[PDB]
């Protein structure tokens, strides 16, 4: 659970 979060984050931005 945490690393699913930890390991997707840095991609979050792209579509902003």
């Known amino acids: 659970f ?3 979060x ?3 984050a840095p991609q979050x ?3 902003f």
């Open 6 to 8: 930890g390991l997707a």
């Open 2 to 4: 945490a690393a699913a």
């Open 13 to 15: 931005p792209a579509p």
